[PDB]
Design a protein around this ligand. Sequence first.
Ligand code: NDP
Ligand code: SF4
Ligand code: ZN
Lengths: 149, 71, 127, 158, 185, 330, 376, 99
Amino acid sequence: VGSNIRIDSRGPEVMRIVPRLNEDINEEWISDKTRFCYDGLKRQRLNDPMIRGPDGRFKAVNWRDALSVIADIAHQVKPEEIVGVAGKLSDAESMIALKDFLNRMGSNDVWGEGIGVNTNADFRSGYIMNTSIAGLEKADVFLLVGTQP
Amino acid sequence: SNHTAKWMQDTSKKSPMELINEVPPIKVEGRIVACEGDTNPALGHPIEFICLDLPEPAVCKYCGLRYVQDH
Amino acid sequence: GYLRCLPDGNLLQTKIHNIGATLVGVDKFGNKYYEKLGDTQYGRHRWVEYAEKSRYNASQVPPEWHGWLHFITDHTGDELLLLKPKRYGVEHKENLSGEGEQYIYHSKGHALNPGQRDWTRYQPWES
Amino acid sequence: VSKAAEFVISKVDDLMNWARRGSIWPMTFGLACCAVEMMHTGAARYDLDRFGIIFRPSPRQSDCMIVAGTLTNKMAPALRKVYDQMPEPRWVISMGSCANGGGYYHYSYSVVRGCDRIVPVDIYVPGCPPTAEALLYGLLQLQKKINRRKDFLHWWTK
Amino acid sequence: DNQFIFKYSWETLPKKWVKKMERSEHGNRFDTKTDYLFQLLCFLKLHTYTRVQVLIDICGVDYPSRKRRFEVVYNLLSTRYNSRIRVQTSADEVTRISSVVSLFPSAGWWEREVWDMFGVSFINHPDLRRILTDYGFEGHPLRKDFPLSGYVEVRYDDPEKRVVSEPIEMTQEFRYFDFASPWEQ
Amino acid sequence: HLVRKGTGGRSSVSGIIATVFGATGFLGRYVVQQLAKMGSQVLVPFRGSEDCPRHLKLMGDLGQIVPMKYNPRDESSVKAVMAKANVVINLIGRDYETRNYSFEEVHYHMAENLAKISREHGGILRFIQVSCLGASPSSPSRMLRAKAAAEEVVLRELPEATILKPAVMIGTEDRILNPWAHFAKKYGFIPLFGNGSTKIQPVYVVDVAAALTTVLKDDGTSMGKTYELGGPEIFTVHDLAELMYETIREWPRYVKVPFPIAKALATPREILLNKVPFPLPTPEILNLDKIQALTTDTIVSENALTFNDLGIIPHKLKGYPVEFLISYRK
Amino acid sequence: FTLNFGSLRLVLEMNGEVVERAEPHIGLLHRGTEKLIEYKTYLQALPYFDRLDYVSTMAQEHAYSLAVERLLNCEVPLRAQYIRVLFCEITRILNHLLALTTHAMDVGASTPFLWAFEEREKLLEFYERVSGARMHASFIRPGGVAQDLPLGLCRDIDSFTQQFASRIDELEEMLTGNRIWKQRLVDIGTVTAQQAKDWGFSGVMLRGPGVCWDLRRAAPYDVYDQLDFDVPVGTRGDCYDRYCIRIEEMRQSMRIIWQCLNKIPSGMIKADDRKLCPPSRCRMKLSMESSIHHFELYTEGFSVPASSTYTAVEAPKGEFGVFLVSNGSNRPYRCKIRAPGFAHLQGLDFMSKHHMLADVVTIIGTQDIVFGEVDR
Amino acid sequence: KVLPNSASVEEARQRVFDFFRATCRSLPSVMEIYNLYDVTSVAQLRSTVASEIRKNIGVSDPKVIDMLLFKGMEELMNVVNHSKAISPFLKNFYSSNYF
Ligand SMILES: NC(=O)C1=CN([C@@H]2O[C@H](COP(=O)(O)OP(=O)(O)OC[C@H]3O[C@@H](n4cnc5c(N)ncnc54)[C@H](OP(=O)(O)O)[C@@H]3O)[C@@H](O)[C@H]2O)C=CC1
Ligand code: SF4
Ligand SMILES: [Zn+2]
């Protein structure tokens, strides 16, 4: 939904999340997951580049070493069997950077999370909410197929 | 527990939580009480009125004292 | 303790002032509290002999006698000892502050603290 | 290293500490509004001349610098220059809150967050202003601190 | 009170430079143009029935929203007629306004202070060096955009054997508490 | 792995807890200042008086500079000092002897003890030990031989240990230029030793401190290396004396006493020190160990790693390093 | 030639020991007080005025509270007004004693210093009994005062007033009439009334020439218009006449103190409205609205209407003024602090012209420059 | 002495020339003030001052030019009174996230 929120923080940590007015997306409301997702930002948080050694345990290394080993392994393999997967949450900058890097490495196998093998992604009107939330307000009959809002 | 160990490290004297759990509940005849903190209202906390319909003791939320209805 | 007067000179002044005084009290640490009214100026009618002539300190006065000595209250230390709270409380300790790292107060993050606590407000993955 | 030489060394150190404790010659660094309370300390009531404290206007003859008041970025170089002229046996008493950690002007431009950043201070005197009673307590604390200086023993065991 | 010489001034003063006037119990206010401020103060100081011959002070106020952010205020007093008057103008960062050191000799240090705190330069000041802040200060502290803690801080550098100035790295950052009530308006 | 948690400068983290043994000396000031400027925490273990690390307190943020009192002969005290350490720096060493501490005890045995404790305490990531440039097993000087043996035993016991070998260091608190200036002011002349034809490579102390900081910041390239540190150009002793005299703006004067009579003059101090139970004045100039070190040239070997290999160029010794000698003018 | 002195830095141009000109450098105590006041609430900014002109503490509190009440229009009870006057006059006595004795020490007279410090210790004991600390007691607040007078304070102040009349007679006998004191003071740093008006002098430095103008009579901001005191003026403005004016001001301050003690009323100590003055502890612990108002007044502040004003009071140094500009918020938008040391230190240049070094230090002592208020 | 704002580009240029003259005449005093004779290169210092003046050519407002000259003269007085290959992106990346 991309509901607009205000993150209230006291120092280096997020303290709470509250809704904010956006009549086009969310009037004044907010879901429980959106409101209380701030707690997960302080648990199981990765904070150092790591490499899995021969023993199977992770050793923390520098960004230089991590990038060097990644680049060496990427150059070692042929570009046909190189795949890139975008996560559930990712900004357009990161996704376009990943696509450009993998394409310049010779691979055309970059895809995002929740995208099928044969998806006709050539039409924004095809894959977005054309009616918009205001149109949903203006609607009269709904046909919900394959979705549980 | 975790909170007490977070603000205190002495771990040899009795923490305020243990003392306030050790002080017994105060039995009162009426259905409502006036919780003031000590014998002098001006030297305690703002007055707190506590409902005692629930069977379990009710914490004052100020100087928590666990008032319990008589019958 | 009278031989300390010759190399102290301040205990000498105290002993000179304890000629006509009346011993109003004594604390559990040995400090003897004196009062002297009559023809005495206002600022010098209550005082203490610390009973530790070698290394007497201004912070050795317990809170029970602190107010009476500082002229805050007319209540002697005995009444405040009677009114001392129960179920909690610590004994009076002097302001050491230099007598030892094991004696002075240390913050939770100080390296000299027996138990030093980290401060990051996040839990790493910790494989 | 023996037990009689150790006793003689202890007696010599005790004499030296007694002399340095009874003949403290502090110098005022009287900025802002702890200096008035310092003059109250030097007054008739809480007299400092009894304990040996006399204020020497010349830093070359002074023993310990008592910084009382707010330290400004415009004045910190002057404070450091004056401190550097003091003799090697030297001490610092930071009086008030401005000279300790910036005090009431901690979040302010042109204010040094305590004199500890400019000179090595030995004893802090909390208060704003600290009572003349408390400042004399701090001076007695300086006497106590310099009452445990085993300079002769340290020189002997080198 | 004592709104006598204020009304007399508005009756006798030339109307060319009186941009606006305010009749208040908090202080009678004149707001004019920077071109005619010197002439206006010369008239008030010298006239026999508006003798504001002592300059109380010169102040500056920063208004980032306005085109001319700086507001230069002059508080003057008339001891002969026992009343205070206020004359202010608007100046920006670059433009130089006229100096009144010749009329009131006390205005030199207040004008230097205004320069120091805001950056409003004066035309006929005998000197306009900084007065209050540190030697070699770079910014103007009293501007609203100027951070409260400043940009640099000083410390003793042992290898240099001198007190050096370094960019701020202060611990325990200033905690701005937003107490404003939404029902105050 | 150390983690940085700040922009830099004062009031940062830098993820380094450095225990600096011998931090109250000439180089200790600069190394502790550099470490505290980095934002790291510095544990300063001081031997005697409580005011010895006093200045070191002002160069770091609150709680960053921690002074610890210890006994150098106490293994338990050394372990307690090194309990919270992350990296260890060793600067302990005296230019002369005492009835209690000899050259072997102050350098070799203490370096061995530090290496053993660092090996036992598995949390140590870096061990930077400072010796002299002329430290060789065949060097005539007993102090240089002891420092060479100490560096050898440090390498043997703890292979993950970097060894710096700076040449003679000049600065505001140095022990060569200051005694030379004092002698010149007091007597109008300075004593050259063997007509002052021998050559050295004096190095600036802040440059040495920056070299040590770079060694600490190395990304694993100097775990078991020895770095010889020297100035930009070779200075003869006579040339250094002339530079000193030019800086003070006094007329140079030399006597050029021969090595045999210099050694004869410096000889009785050692036997007297070993005989009497009371301490003797420290030899500022007439030091037999200094004479023995001066018997042979002390310059870079051109083989070991230098300032160029480490990554910082040395500072020229005319104006930046000798600016302290102005206070000696008139 | 230029001679430098180094929180008073001063450069003097000398020809024959005669001071051609003197230039002070003042910023050595700049602390960003105005910026901090802008960044803090009004109640949090009152201690800044405590710190400004620290020799005269409660005068600055009085000026700040008067400015806030002018911008706020809240009525202060008569008892609060009378105790404010009493402690303002105590403050005036303290400042005059300190100024006179520091001037005497700078001249060379060392002994009156400690007698006047005994008197000052008595007055600081009064401060500590009535309020928190001996100095920088945040006792005067907008709308009234912090707390009521402790019982016995009036009797102690009466005893002090009698003994202090004796002490002022004592000090005047020692200092006034001394040939050395006269030779040090008379015809030193004379100022004409035109010069004082041009350079913006105020207080004793302005009444010394004989302008015959006082703020407590021109604009009475208290019960001052019911206290029928006297205002001394100098026949020929110089150090001696300014010193005599200060002595007479001490006497008149004692007079005003006695009048306030005699006619102090019985009532409340602060403004009646809890929107502007915090409620008592019992009221906030017993009443729901009082708890709300205490909470709001101690988190937020009273929101003054958006206006700009200049409020000046007769501080012991001179006219101390505060120029407050608000924007309707809980924090002051702008706070300019006109201290009566900033103008006097400008006057130093022409006052200590053709004089000598001892005359320069005498002029500094007479002007009584406290550097906190000049570096506000 | 402070002067009124320059009403012409020629007047601003003349004031800039006067300020540059003042800097050049005051350069040898800075020599004895700072004592960096080893690597000063007074000619290089003059070149750097000229380079600063030349990098401040994008300004065209006479008021801004006058203010810049005033601040430059202030800085001159302060100095006289002795008051002191892995591409750029990857180095910043290895240093910290905020760049
Ligand atoms: N001459 C020079 O400057 C040069 C020295 N070096 C090497 O660098 C090392 C460090 O030099 P530097 O810092 O300038 O000299 P210092 O002698 O000033 O530093 C040594 C430090 O350790 C302390 N110390 C001395 N002896 C002992 C001991 N027996 N036990 C414990 N602590 C002791 C010293 O005094 P305290 O006990 O008061 O702390 C001082 O704090 C030298 O030992 C030498 O090997 C290399 C090139 C040139
Ligand atoms: S600590 Fe307080 S009393 Fe002392 S100078 Fe600072 S503000 Fe004044
Ligand atoms: Zn309760």
